[PDB]
Amino acid sequence: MRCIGISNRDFVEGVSGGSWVDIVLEHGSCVTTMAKNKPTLDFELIETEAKQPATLRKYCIEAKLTNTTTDSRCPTQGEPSLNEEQDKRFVCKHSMVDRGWGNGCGLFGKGGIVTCAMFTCKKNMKGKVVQPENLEYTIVITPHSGEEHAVGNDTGKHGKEIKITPQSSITEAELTGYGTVTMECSPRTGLDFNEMVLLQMENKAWLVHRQWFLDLPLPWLPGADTQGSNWIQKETLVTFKNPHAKKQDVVVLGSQEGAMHTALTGATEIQMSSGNLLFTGHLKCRLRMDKLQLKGMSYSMCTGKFKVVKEIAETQHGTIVIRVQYEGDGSPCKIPFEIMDLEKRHVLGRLITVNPIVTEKDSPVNIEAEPPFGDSYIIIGVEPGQLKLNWFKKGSSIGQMIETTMRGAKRMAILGDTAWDFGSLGGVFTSIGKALHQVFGAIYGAAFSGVSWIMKILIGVIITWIGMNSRSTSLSVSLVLVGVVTLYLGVMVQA
Amino acid sequence: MRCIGISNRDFVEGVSGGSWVDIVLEHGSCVTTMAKNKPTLDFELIETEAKQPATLRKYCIEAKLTNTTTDSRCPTQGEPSLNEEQDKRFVCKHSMVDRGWGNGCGLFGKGGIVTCAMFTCKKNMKGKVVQPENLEYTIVITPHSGEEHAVGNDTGKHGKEIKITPQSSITEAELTGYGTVTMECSPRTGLDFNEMVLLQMENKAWLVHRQWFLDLPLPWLPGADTQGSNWIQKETLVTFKNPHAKKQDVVVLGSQEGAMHTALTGATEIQMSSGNLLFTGHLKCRLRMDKLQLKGMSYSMCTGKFKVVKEIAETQHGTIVIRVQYEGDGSPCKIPFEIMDLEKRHVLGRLITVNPIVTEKDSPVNIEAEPPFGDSYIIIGVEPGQLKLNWFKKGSSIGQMIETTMRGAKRMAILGDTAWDFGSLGGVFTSIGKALHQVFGAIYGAAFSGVSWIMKILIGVIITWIGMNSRSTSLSVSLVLVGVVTLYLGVMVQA
Amino acid sequence: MRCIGISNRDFVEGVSGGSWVDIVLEHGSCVTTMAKNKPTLDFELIETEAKQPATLRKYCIEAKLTNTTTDSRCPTQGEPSLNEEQDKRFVCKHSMVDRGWGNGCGLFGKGGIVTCAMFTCKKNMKGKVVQPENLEYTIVITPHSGEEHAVGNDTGKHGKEIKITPQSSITEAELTGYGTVTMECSPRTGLDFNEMVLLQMENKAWLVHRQWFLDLPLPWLPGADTQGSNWIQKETLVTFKNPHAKKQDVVVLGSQEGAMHTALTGATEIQMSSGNLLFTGHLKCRLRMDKLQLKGMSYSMCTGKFKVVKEIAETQHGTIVIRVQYEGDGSPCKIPFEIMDLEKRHVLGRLITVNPIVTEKDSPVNIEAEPPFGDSYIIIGVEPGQLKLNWFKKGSSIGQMIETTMRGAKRMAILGDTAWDFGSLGGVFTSIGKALHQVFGAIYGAAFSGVSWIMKILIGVIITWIGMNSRSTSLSVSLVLVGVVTLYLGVMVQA
Amino acid sequence: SVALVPHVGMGLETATETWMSSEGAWKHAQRIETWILRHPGFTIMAAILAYTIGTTHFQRALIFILLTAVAP
Amino acid sequence: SVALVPHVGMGLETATETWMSSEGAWKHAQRIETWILRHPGFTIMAAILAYTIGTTHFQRALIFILLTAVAP
Amino acid sequence: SVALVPHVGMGLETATETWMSSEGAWKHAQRIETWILRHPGFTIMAAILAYTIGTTHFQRALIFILLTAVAP
């Protein structure tokens, strides 16, 4: 369940090389996999915790100045200096002013003057990092089989919750009758911290490309402040104005929090003060099957009074899924059920729940079915054939190939290399393909990284054109290079 | 007298125009000048008291370190820090070190590490700017008036020393029996001050140019003083030793003293101790006659008998001097001096002290004369002849013709165009000639300073080569531009 | 231990030529290395303590001048001279001043006047020296893997400390159980002493070479002066000056401590408070592997129960080094170690701590291996699987390969010539190479010395171009010269 | 500052929207308009220098749009 | 002086940082260059005669850059 | 350090004698020579780069002198 009506999703028919599935999940998604035997499963990856973070650096959004002063000497004769300048906890500047004669000096012409200001930070913000070893994930997989817990329940026992930390590797999935999943996460090459900079603001935080968070302007600390205030800089903020030439003074300015956010814009949202748990995983792994029997198995096929409890709407695709009602045989009673085609048998089913199974005799329970393209009959087929429903999709197999083409592609650019992890067990094609993409990706289409939206599509064109009208053969490759790739990115980038 | 046997020395002939003569004064030198009538005078510079200047800068030669604390921070985990980095009066430094499970870390690779040493000194540079508000020159002048007192007697009231502060002007020199000689002296064009940097150094001193001064490394202070201990550029001393990897500690970086000295090598030394007597330089002044007297006109002619204590010298071109204990009557008057070709008369040589006058009975005075080339016949007396003296002066024709040529050139070398201010007066060809070589020179054989024998004279030899094989005319001016010009100026600069 | 987290150090797999392996050990570097057997070895040349040196140049840097007696004469007759011009310890120079009725004596003209002073010193260097008989190298080689007693902390016993030395050479070291390691080092031709001079300053000290340290300036002195003060120079230092014309006196050039500190810059340091401990200095050594059992090659393969007790971490390239704790029964059991691939044991576990053997159980051992360029799985269990975690390198082999080359230069230089001696008997290659590189290397490793960082590079520039033009493509001989030579050498030395 | 060099080009794009997916990203061009309308002139100048500079037509067009966007 | 031609080139270049090295190794060129712009006059002229003497692409180049250094 | 800056250039001058006189006046070059003696290799080297480099006879001479000099 909780794998119906989510959009971020995909079906994985197969198990290859025996219990050998390859899957990737992007925090906000449901991963569904089918297999001739074993109740296909639903994988929801949620809370991805982290503990023991390094607060390296510490900028401040607000600033303030105190006990400011300033002085001069007289043209040339000395480059004026003030005592308190000693405590580098201030901020100062040497400037020139035509401090002449009557001014109260000596030999007019032009002189020096410095202003001092005891600095004071106000409402810093600070970042923080994490040792991969401490990225406590939470993956929760579960089996269907109707239930009141229906589709989408934020409570009950649902395939349990296997909290996984690379501080280990292979974990068991104890499932009531349903078996025991063997999951092997790849908590390391997933998101990729210690490359990331977990920073906050104030009850709102952000994950950020390291090499940036360690260069974006502002007056900083060190991640050892522990009573210091020797903000390397103090200069990025607070500025000195020299109106005309005299009363050369200093000033504080405004608490960047504003622009901060408004520059942190292109960056992903996150967590922090809620215990801290930076969402948005992009984690992959192997779903090891082997043990995953189909429960309730050893039971007849209980016949009798059947009813329905809802109609039949669908998102994902043919995700038509209907609940029923029952009275006939208490205890785990398998429920007859099919996917026939308009009267004339020659069924064409896509039953997606490895046989339902009634139970509580009072519990309505439901079912998950992927009917065909056009017309179709799902049939409860019980006693006198009791009930047959005809629904009707629209799933023209071709419109299918297309929306699929894209859909995958979308998941292509968003996972890069890793994307190929949906292709559980390759060899030659899918395997080498993953390979080629690896390098072809990391470089070139990722050798000019840092590029930007506009520019992106812009180069998409300028480049296609240096292509379009070229000179024999080669251009084909030039264009492609343009095609989708840059292009499709430019229109399908900016997360 | 004074300018007598004192090397250097310049003899000038001028009353011209009807009132003045353009003359210079180079301390260790002296210009004896006169012309028609007047007690012919000996001018000499001597002492330049610069008063109550200011202290621009203040470096240090003796630098020591203390408290030296240091701390680090494991790989990544932020740039390492320590409070003490607050007290500006400390040298801090961030560095990297290979860290392992050994030093109790976590990652290894290389963490950060920092050092902190309070900074202090002994024996400071302490430059100084003077300000021509008071750059008082001291001038000593005087007549010859024989007198067995002597001719070098730097004691007593032999000419009386005098003051000259641009604070005011016109120096009206009172001078016994003569009157009052007047001088216009421009202390405001000599040592292009407040362009210079009078420097001190523990007890040593040196007139050192501004910019050179304001570039010399070493740590430096304000010129404000009181609390010093806030020297910048401490990076001239105290060094951070990072042997191979692990560990990194500091070192004072030795004293500086003598280094400093020899670092100099160009500045002209100077006694700056006793309220500083700033020797060296060249005061230029216009000299106006009149209101003078020789105390001889209206002073009889004195008759016969002359003892002659000592012989006859010459030195700077036959400027012979002689001492004669006159006898005859009393109450001194004139003494008839003469010089003609052996036997046959023709007063062939120029006398140089148109006042050979006796003072009192006993005081074997002295007169100075310039017997010409040849073995001129000197004589002194009246009727019974009383005296003749064979005196043979070598070369003296073309030999001295060129000799003085050089003398003069060198004058031009040191003190540039300002030297035409030694000719006499307005002249025309002169005055403007000066205003020509003036900028001309200011912009070629000079307008490219920062060299030496080697580099400079070498530049010559080459400007020559090229200046020797280029078709047409131009070449020529280029050739002399070099040789004797680029060159001579060269071989002489640096004395 | 001793070689985990020390960076920049090299390793050698396999010995060859029957225990006959070639090693070059430094101070910063260390050698990890092992054969197809024998417990791996950490090789660090540590204390290189010298014992008996002598003095041959007791240089001065702060001498005061006293007494000062100056005599004079008169033009021609006798070039002045005071006896003191013979009490060696006094300095003196023949000068000339003016000399006329004015000096108050002579008979006009410029002439003789010479002066002298007592040259007593203070600060003094002490350039000791040592024959290749008085320099003991202590080598710390340690038996990899074992206990959680840190893969570091120099302190405490871990691998012994053999004391090889030119007194003898080629020695053995008793390494508990495993065996007796026996190296055949050869101080003989490493350091290249006697060309070196141990110069102590105010306490610091630099081993700078003789063939210059002798040609250095200042006041000379032999070796055991003491009550000698028969200083051979002084002239260098102190200068009694005479300006513009007359008179003069003696002055000191000033303490040069500093300057010199800033002098020998560019010649390695060396502590100097307890006898001596002259660091740095590559030492060439033979390595005998014979008597060396890997210890416990006769055991069982644990049972299972390995709760790790330390993350893992990838260190200074390669050295991934885990720490595991095993509770159980077995006792003294070999660790079941495998660095495999994703499941399908294609296993490629280059563990490099051969036969890592659990000692007395209750003791968290640890080991170090070199996982591939991508992501490999790691495991150490057995019975019910026990343990397996996940891993990922970063760069990609080829990257490392280039870095193999980085060494290539940062090795084929520095420890030049001997650079070759880094490999274990390869005959043909290594052999002829050295025989050549020692030669052609000697040329531009002879004539082209003492030249500054920059300057060398320039030679590069002008050369690479002068080659470039080419008359019968021999220029390649030229470029190859520039290439990774003139350039590299230059662009990488001085430090 | 907190004005420029945001978090664009980095490369941590995810499955969920970031901090200002549509809004800001579109706003950029939104403002080039703001400006480019505000002060025609530079448009003028640009396309002109454009016209004579380059001449490959596509050339012109290119530095025209280009130049225009560069001018804050 | 102990302030001129000091155990710099020689050799014995130990694979472990030296002394005032580094900081200095660069400070030097930095020193002159500064001077250079302190007196462009000399540069200007030199530059010229260089432009003249010998000359041949990089040729002229060399004479110059070299002299430039030459002067302190 | 302090060491590399001969106050000459400015040339405040005098008819007198500056601090360091002939001593430095010649040392400069003499020391250069001492050094030459030290690495005669490099002289042969420099002259080489010369004799071979460009040549107008002068050229050669010129650059030769320089290099040999320049070596700090």
Ligand SMILES: *[C@@H]1O[C@H](CO)[C@@H](O[C@@H]2O[C@H](CO)[C@@H](O)[C@H](O)[C@H]2NC(C)=O)[C@H](O)[C@H]1NC(C)=O
């Ligand atoms: C979410 O799951 C919970 C778990 O059962 C469902 O809550 C039950 O709702 C029924 C009907 O109101 C109550 O009688 C039970 O007592 C509830 N169980 C408890 C204790 O939570 C809930 O219906 C589900 N919500 C949906 C529709 O997702």
Ligand SMILES: *[C@@H]1O[C@H](CO)[C@@H](O[C@@H]2O[C@H](CO)[C@@H](O)[C@H](O)[C@H]2NC(C)=O)[C@H](O)[C@H]1NC(C)=O
């Ligand atoms: C310098 O001039 C002074 C006059 O002020 C001379 O001093 C007198 O010299 C005479 C004869 O030598 C003595 O009899 C007197 O006793 C001295 N009186 C004074 C002024 O002290 C002095 O001899 C001259 N010597 C020089 C330096 O030329």
Ligand SMILES: *[C@@H]1O[C@H](CO)[C@@H](O[C@@H]2O[C@H](CO)[C@@H](O)[C@H](O)[C@H]2NC(C)=O)[C@H](O)[C@H]1NC(C)=O
């Ligand atoms: C360096 O070696 C020493 C042993 O020579 C280790 O220190 C020991 O630590 C244990 C732990 O409690 C003590 O019981 C021993 O008494 C210590 N030995 C002493 C006195 O030095 C040390 O741990 C090693 N380095 C590291 C960081 O492990």
Ligand SMILES: *[C@@H]1O[C@H](CO)[C@@H](O)[C@H](O)[C@H]1NC(C)=O
């Ligand atoms: C700074 O100035 C404030 C005035 O608002 C004063 O209260 C405070 O004592 C001063 N702090 C010092 C000691 O500089």
Ligand SMILES: *[C@@H]1O[C@H](CO)[C@@H](O)[C@H](O)[C@H]1NC(C)=O
């Ligand atoms: C510095 O160290 C000294 C001891 O050398 C100590 O007396 C002093 O309190 C410390 N604090 C300072 C002045 O840095």
Ligand SMILES: *[C@@H]1O[C@H](CO)[C@@H](O)[C@H](O)[C@H]1NC(C)=O
């Ligand atoms: C010379 O020197 C000594 C000591 O340096 C000092 O007492 C005096 O000036 C002279 N000695 C004697 C009296 O000969």
